[PDB]
Design an enzyme around this catalytic site. Structure first.
Site, PDB file in Angstrom:
ATOM      1  N   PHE A   1      14.568 -11.546  14.692  1.00  5.84           N
ATOM      2  CA  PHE A   1      14.590 -11.016  16.054  1.00  5.84           C
ATOM      3  C   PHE A   1      13.861 -11.968  16.991  1.00  5.84           C
ATOM      4  CE2 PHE A   1      14.948  -7.093  13.341  1.00  5.84           C
ATOM      5  CZ  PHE A   1      16.218  -6.742  13.717  1.00  5.84           C
TER       6      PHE A   1
ATOM      7  N   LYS B   1      -3.056   7.282  14.491  1.00  7.25           N
ATOM      8  CA  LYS B   1      -4.134   6.587  13.778  1.00  7.25           C
ATOM      9  C   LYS B   1      -5.371   6.453  14.664  1.00  7.25           C
ATOM     10  CE  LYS B   1      -3.553   5.523  10.037  1.00  7.25           C
ATOM     11  NZ  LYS B   1      -3.453   6.118   8.705  1.00  7.25           N
TER      12      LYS B   1
ATOM     13  N   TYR C   1       3.031   6.650  15.897  1.00  9.19           N
ATOM     14  CA  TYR C   1       2.278   6.413  14.656  1.00  9.19           C
ATOM     15  C   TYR C   1       0.918   5.773  15.006  1.00  9.19           C
ATOM     16  CZ  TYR C   1       0.467   3.972  10.559  1.00  9.19           C
ATOM     17  OH  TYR C   1      -0.361   3.493   9.569  1.00  9.19           O
TER      18      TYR C   1
ATOM     19  N   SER D   1      -4.994   1.649  10.716  1.00  5.75           N
ATOM     20  CA  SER D   1      -3.958   0.655  11.003  1.00  5.75           C
ATOM     21  C   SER D   1      -4.454  -0.254  12.130  1.00  5.75           C
ATOM     22  CB  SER D   1      -2.654   1.313  11.433  1.00  5.75           C
ATOM     23  OG  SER D   1      -1.761   0.355  11.977  1.00  5.75           O
TER      24      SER D   1
ATOM     25  N   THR E   1      -2.648  -1.521  14.197  1.00  6.06           N
ATOM     26  CA  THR E   1      -1.847  -1.229  15.399  1.00  6.06           C
ATOM     27  C   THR E   1      -2.683  -0.453  16.433  1.00  6.06           C
ATOM     28  OG1 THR E   1      -0.788   0.785  14.547  1.00  6.06           O
ATOM     29  CG2 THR E   1       0.368  -1.317  14.131  1.00  6.06           C
TER      30      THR E   1
HETATM   31  N1  LIG Z   1       2.415   0.676   4.701  1.00  7.52           N
HETATM   32  C1  LIG Z   1       1.937   0.242   5.872  1.00  7.52           C
HETATM   33  O1  LIG Z   1       2.610  -0.487   6.611  1.00  7.52           O
HETATM   34  C2  LIG Z   1       0.577   0.698   6.330  1.00  7.52           C
HETATM   35  C3  LIG Z   1      -0.178  -0.051   7.242  1.00  7.52           C
HETATM   36  C4  LIG Z   1      -1.406   0.418   7.696  1.00  7.52           C
HETATM   37  C5  LIG Z   1      -1.879   1.628   7.253  1.00  7.52           C
HETATM   38  N2  LIG Z   1      -1.151   2.355   6.369  1.00  7.52           N
HETATM   39  C6  LIG Z   1      -1.740   3.655   5.962  1.00  7.52           C
HETATM   40  O2  LIG Z   1      -1.759   3.747   4.558  1.00  7.52           O
HETATM   41  C7  LIG Z   1      -1.487   5.099   4.120  1.00  7.52           C
HETATM   42  C8  LIG Z   1      -0.392   5.109   3.054  1.00  7.52           C
HETATM   43  O3  LIG Z   1       0.389   3.923   3.214  1.00  7.52           O
HETATM   44  P1  LIG Z   1       1.406   3.644   2.066  1.00  7.52           P
HETATM   45  O4  LIG Z   1       2.049   2.418   2.613  1.00  7.52           O
HETATM   46  O5  LIG Z   1       0.900   3.582   0.663  1.00  7.52           O
HETATM   47  O6  LIG Z   1       2.527   4.767   2.206  1.00  7.52           O
HETATM   48  P2  LIG Z   1       3.204   5.758   1.172  1.00  7.52           P
HETATM   49  O7  LIG Z   1       4.195   6.643   1.902  1.00  7.52           O
HETATM   50  O8  LIG Z   1       3.687   4.987   0.007  1.00  7.52           O
HETATM   51  O9  LIG Z   1       1.959   6.638   0.654  1.00  7.52           O
HETATM   52  C9  LIG Z   1       1.529   7.810   1.335  1.00  7.52           C
HETATM   53  C10 LIG Z   1       1.610   8.975   0.380  1.00  7.52           C
HETATM   54  O10 LIG Z   1       1.204  10.171   1.075  1.00  7.52           O
HETATM   55  C11 LIG Z   1       2.046  11.231   0.622  1.00  7.52           C
HETATM   56  N3  LIG Z   1       2.026  12.294   1.614  1.00  7.52           N
HETATM   57  C12 LIG Z   1       2.654  12.282   2.837  1.00  7.52           C
HETATM   58  N4  LIG Z   1       2.500  13.391   3.523  1.00  7.52           N
HETATM   59  C13 LIG Z   1       1.689  14.174   2.702  1.00  7.52           C
HETATM   60  C14 LIG Z   1       1.189  15.477   2.857  1.00  7.52           C
HETATM   61  N5  LIG Z   1       1.436  16.216   3.944  1.00  7.52           N
HETATM   62  N6  LIG Z   1       0.431  15.987   1.846  1.00  7.52           N
HETATM   63  C15 LIG Z   1       0.244  15.238   0.742  1.00  7.52           C
HETATM   64  N7  LIG Z   1       0.657  13.985   0.481  1.00  7.52           N
HETATM   65  C16 LIG Z   1       1.406  13.520   1.514  1.00  7.52           C
HETATM   66  C17 LIG Z   1       3.403  10.586   0.351  1.00  7.52           C
HETATM   67  O11 LIG Z   1       4.214  11.370  -0.515  1.00  7.52           O
HETATM   68  C18 LIG Z   1       2.990   9.219  -0.239  1.00  7.52           C
HETATM   69  O12 LIG Z   1       2.951   9.199  -1.666  1.00  7.52           O
HETATM   70  C19 LIG Z   1      -1.260   5.908   5.400  1.00  7.52           C
HETATM   71  O13 LIG Z   1      -2.553   6.337   5.811  1.00  7.52           O
HETATM   72  C20 LIG Z   1      -0.859   4.834   6.422  1.00  7.52           C
HETATM   73  O14 LIG Z   1      -1.068   5.190   7.773  1.00  7.52           O
HETATM   74  C21 LIG Z   1       0.043   1.896   5.921  1.00  7.52           C
HETATM   75  C1  LIG Z   2       8.803 -10.169  13.809  1.00  9.87           C
HETATM   76  C2  LIG Z   2      10.168 -10.138  13.239  1.00  9.87           C
HETATM   77  C3  LIG Z   2      10.731  -9.456  12.237  1.00  9.87           C
HETATM   78  C4  LIG Z   2      12.061  -9.904  12.163  1.00  9.87           C
HETATM   79  N1  LIG Z   2      13.081  -9.459  11.335  1.00  9.87           N
HETATM   80  C5  LIG Z   2      13.079  -8.334  10.522  1.00  9.87           C
HETATM   81  O1  LIG Z   2      12.103  -7.614  10.410  1.00  9.87           O
HETATM   82  N2  LIG Z   2      14.239  -8.107   9.890  1.00  9.87           N
HETATM   83  C6  LIG Z   2      14.376  -7.088   8.884  1.00  9.87           C
HETATM   84  C7  LIG Z   2      15.394  -6.034   9.272  1.00  9.87           C
HETATM   85  C8  LIG Z   2      16.816  -6.571   9.401  1.00  9.87           C
HETATM   86  O2  LIG Z   2      17.125  -7.752   9.204  1.00  9.87           O
HETATM   87  N3  LIG Z   2      17.737  -5.622   9.701  1.00  9.87           N
HETATM   88  C9  LIG Z   2      19.144  -5.727   9.788  1.00  9.87           C
HETATM   89  C10 LIG Z   2      19.846  -6.867   9.393  1.00  9.87           C
HETATM   90  C11 LIG Z   2      21.210  -6.871   9.508  1.00  9.87           C
HETATM   91  N4  LIG Z   2      21.929  -5.852  10.000  1.00  9.87           N
HETATM   92  C12 LIG Z   2      21.237  -4.762  10.369  1.00  9.87           C
HETATM   93  C13 LIG Z   2      19.877  -4.649  10.290  1.00  9.87           C
HETATM   94  N5  LIG Z   2      12.307 -10.827  13.053  1.00  9.87           N
HETATM   95  O3  LIG Z   2      11.089 -10.969  13.782  1.00  9.87           O
END
Ligand SMILES: NC(=O)c1ccc[n+]([C@@H]2O[C@H](COP(=O)([O-])OP(=O)(O)OC[C@H]3O[C@@H](n4cnc5c(N)ncnc54)[C@H](O)[C@@H]3O)[C@@H](O)[C@H]2O)c1
Ligand SMILES: Cc1cc(NC(=O)NCCC(=O)Nc2ccncc2)no1
Length: 344
Positions: A225, A160, A156, A131, A133
């Site tokens: 926000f 990572k 989180y 990530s 982040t």
């Molecule tokens: N979605 C994002 O915002 C984002 C951003 C950056 C990195 N990632 C990374 O990508 C990966 C997956 O992201 P995604 O968005 O597809 O999420 P997702 O939740 O859709 O996929 C992750 C999968 O892992 C499975 N899983 C969770 N815990 C497990 C366990 N203990 N054993 C076996 N399977 C398990 C879940 O059931 C799921 O199907 C993670 O490594 C996450 O940190 C995601």
């Molecule tokens: C950088 C950034 C993101 C952002 N807005 C956002 O992510 N909104 C999605 C979630 C949301 O609207 N929640 C909500 C709405 C109404 N009532 C309760 C909860 N603005 O700046």
């Protein structure tokens, strides 16, 4: 016939990556515990059953938890793996603040167990889905791979970063390991068929799921926000990558392993960030629907802008993102129209 293990391969990024593996001529085996994926009417997750239809090819699948050492040992005896792509983990930033120990357990203990079993079976080739982040709050923009890591603002992101450090130390201790760490921000869009995409999430990491629900009529208005940031239009600028481009980047990383690359780290992204208002405007255009919004106060700790430089990935992975914001929205909208409540 050596295979590629995809952990967490039933989920959003994982299912798209399993599809790309089949299209690139690899043989995938998926493990998932269905923490955050939908079961199909037979043995496969619904996502993977549809991947089989889209490709004409089989996906091998085992329901298990990456925390189960005995299950993992059995898995590596039953299948002959050349590499592992690791997505199994917890990933909701807001959830990690409330339940940090669950994040550290699943992400750290799960990954440690995976690395140990890989070592024990001589599988020393890894793609780790990291990530961006891990960079913390930007000190300069766009973020490149020289930017400081570890200043992380939530459990989180810390989990990572800690995983990255453990893999770097493993690679220092054993130069025969190859590992690619891929850092990115927010996956969006969906396969162009519209048949797979992101299922409804409990605690999203970005605004696009909320926007998509406003557009179909399940929420009244997007909350924005803050509109007083140091950005072009005053709203927050964030980084979005089409999940298909992201999945292809994981295949490019897998290919890099064969070069005996050791430990490498690459950002994946389009190279341009998009504001909240830009995202709203693009989804209005894609959907043909009005997307009302309400400006509220800033969320404590949010920054004005955060996005990644993908130049190194072009140079060393041969990879670029081709799909822009309008295509992300079009592909998202198609998945939603065809599957208004996801796989269920
Ligand atoms: N979605 C994002 O915002 C984002 C951003 C950056 C990195 N990632 C990374 O990508 C990966 C997956 O992201 P995604 O968005 O597809 O999420 P997702 O939740 O859709 O996929 C992750 C999968 O892992 C499975 N899983 C969770 N815990 C497990 C366990 N203990 N054993 C076996 N399977 C398990 C879940 O059931 C799921 O199907 C993670 O490594 C996450 O940190 C995601
Ligand atoms: C950088 C950034 C993101 C952002 N807005 C956002 O992510 N909104 C999605 C979630 C949301 O609207 N929640 C909500 C709405 C109404 N009532 C309760 C909860 N603005 O700046």
């Amino acid at each position: 016939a050596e295979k590629v293990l995809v952990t967490g391969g039933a989920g959003y990024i994982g299912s798209h990556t399993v599809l790309e593996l089949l299209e690139a001529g690899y043989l995938p085996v998926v493990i998932d515990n269905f923490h955050n994926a939908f079961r199909g009417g037979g043995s496969l997750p619904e996502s993977l059953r549809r991947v089989q239809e889209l490709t004409g090819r089989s996906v091998e699948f085992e329901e298990m938890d990456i925390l189960d050492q005995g299950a993992l040992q059995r898995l590596f005896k039953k299948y002959s793996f050349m590499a592992v792509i690791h997505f199994a983990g917890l990933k909701a930033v807001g959830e990690s603040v409330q339940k940090p120990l669950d994040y550290y357990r699943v992400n750290l203990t799960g990954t440690i167990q995976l690395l140990e079993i890989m070592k024990a079976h001589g599988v020393k080739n890894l793609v780790f889905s990291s990530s961006a982040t891990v960079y913390g709050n930007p000190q300069y923009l766009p973020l490149d791979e020289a930017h400081p890591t570890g200043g992380c603002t939530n459990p989180y992101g810390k989990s990572k970063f800690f995983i990255e450090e453990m893999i770097r130390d493993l690679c220092q201790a054993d130069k025969t390991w190859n590992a690619v760490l891929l850092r990115y921000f927010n996956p969006t869009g969906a396969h162009a068929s519209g048949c797979i995409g992101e299922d409804p999430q409990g605690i999203p990491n970005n605004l696009m799921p909320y926007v998509s629900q406003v557009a179909i009529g399940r929420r009244e208005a997007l909350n924005v926000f803050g509109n007083d940031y140091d950005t072009e239009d005053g709203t927050g600028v964030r980084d979005y990558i089409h999940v298909v481009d992201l999945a292809k980047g994981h295949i490019a990383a897998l290919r890099k392993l064969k070069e005996q690359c050791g430990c490498r780290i690459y950002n994946l992204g389009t190279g341009t960030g998009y504001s909240v208002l830009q995202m709203v405007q693009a989804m209005e255009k894609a959907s043909g629907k009005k997307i009302p919004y309400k400006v509220v106060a800033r969320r404590e700790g949010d920054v004005a802008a955060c996005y990644a430089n993908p130049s190194l990935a072009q140079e060393e992975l041969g990879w670029t993102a081709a799909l822009g914001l309008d295509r992300m929205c079009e592909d998202l909208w198609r998945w939603q129209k065809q599957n208004p409540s996801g796989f269920g």
